[PDB]
Amino acid sequence: TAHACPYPMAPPNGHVSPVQAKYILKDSFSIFCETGYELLQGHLPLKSFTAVCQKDGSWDRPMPACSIVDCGPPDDLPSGRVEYITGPGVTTYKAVIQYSCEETFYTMKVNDGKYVCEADGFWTSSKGEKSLPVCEPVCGLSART
Amino acid sequence: RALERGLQDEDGYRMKFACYYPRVEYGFQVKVLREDSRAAFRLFETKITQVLHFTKDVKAAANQMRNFLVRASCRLRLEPGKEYLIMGLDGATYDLEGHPQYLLDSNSWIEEMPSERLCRSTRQRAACAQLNDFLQEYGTQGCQV
Task: List every span in chain A annotated with CATH 2.10.70.10.
Answer: 1-68, 69-145
Distance of CA B57 to the CA centre of its chain: 15
What resolution in angstroms, rounded to 1 decimal? 3.8
Do A71 and A95 contact (CB within 8 A), yes or no?
A: yes
> B109 forms bridges with which residues in the sheet?
B87
For residues A96, A101, A103, A108, the Cα torsion angle rounded to the nearest 10 degrees is: -100
Method by which this entry was solved:
X-ray
Query: Which CATH architecture group holds B1-145?
Result: Beta Barrel (2.40)
Do B54 and B26 contact (CB within 8 A), yes or no?
A: yes
Chain A residue nearest residue B129, CA to CA: A44
Chain B residue nearest residue A119, CA to CA: B122
In angstroms, the CA B145 to CA B143 distance is 6
Q: How far is B120 from chain A (nearest CA, A)?
A: 8
Domain A1-68 in CATH 2.10.70.10? The answer is yes
Asked if A72 and B126 come within 8 Å (Cβ–Cβ), the reply is no
For chain A, say whether B126 makes contact (Cβ under 8 Å): yes
Q: What is the DSSP string of B117-141?
A: HHHTSHHHHHHHHHHHHHHHHHHHH
For residues B74, B76, B77, B82, the Cα torsion angle rounded to the nearest 10 degrees is: -160
Q: CATH class for domain A69-145?
A: mainly beta
A89-92 long-range contacts, Cβ below 8 Å, gap at least 24? A89/B117, A91/A117, A91/B117, A91/B121, A92/A68, A92/A117
Spans of all domains in chain B: 1-145
Q: What is the DSSP string of B44-66?
A: EEEEEEEEEE-SS-TT--TT-EE
Asked if A91 and B117 come within 8 Å (Cβ–Cβ), the reply is yes
In angstroms, the CA B15 to CA B54 distance is 16
Q: What is the 3-state secondary structure (H, E, C) of A99-136?
A: EEECCCCEEEECCCCEEEECCCCCEEECCCCCCCCEEE
- φ/ψ region of B13 (left if φ > 0, alpha if ψ in -120 to 50, else beta) reads alpha
Angle at B126 between CA B23 and CA B85, to 5 degrees: 35
